[PDB]
């Protein structure tokens, strides 16, 4: 029970934690499917290497779908899986909470 | 905007992150006010030193209220602040998400 709450809430933190995953997921959930360069533009502080590593981890974690489309020209699209989509209410609530908290700590 | 979503969602992660804060907050929000020894019993894997450090950080972060009551015998009670209470829906949703995710990764 207590271990079940803790193992499970901590798993969630591990999946979305870090400096850029929440922002990647936010753009995919709010705006939809994106190519790599589109995400790279939306997140100007991120490097190619870091964005590739974060997307790879999100894909291996079954949060992001990466699909290759052999059309003319070929393209690779990134999107949320159903598991990713159900993180979106959590990210929304974290943003709303942190918006209010930041004002608290900033203005003091 | 993008920096505002990111700064703010990341602040939230910093406040609740780690191995024991979510569990401390969960017990305080679900069960109410607790003394230190009560929390120590509810979280048997935690050490005195670690529980003192986590509660101190939660208090300094204005998530947990620590009140000394000079009654007979004196007592020190820990509870959530209003800012802590508004984390509870987020923790609830993280637990529900991670419960489903753990089943996904366990059963495979």
Residue numbers in the entry:
A (entry chain A), B (entry chain A): 5 to 112
Quote the authors verbatim:
Although with a higher basal level on DNA binding and transcriptional activation, the K13A mutant (HxlR-K13A) also remained insensitive to FA. Further details of the “N-terminal helix-flipping” mechanism was revealed with structure of HxlR-K13A. The 1.7-Å-resolution HxlR-K13A structure exhibited a more optimal conformation for DNA binding than HxlR-WT but had less significant changes than that of HxlR-WT-FA-DNA. Particularly, helix α1 does not break at Cys11 in the HxlR-K13A structure and residues Cys11 and Ala13 are located on the opposite sides of an intact helix α1, indicating that the absence of “N-terminal helix-flipping” might be the main reason why HxlR-K13A does not undertake the conformation as HxlR-WT-FA-DNA. Further inspection at the N-terminus of HxlR-K13A revealed that the sidechain of Phe9 is located between Trp29’ and Tyr99’ on the dimer interface. In the absence of the “N-terminal helix-flipping”, HxlR-K13A can only adopt an intermediate conformation between that of HxlR-WT and HxlR-WT-FA-DNA.
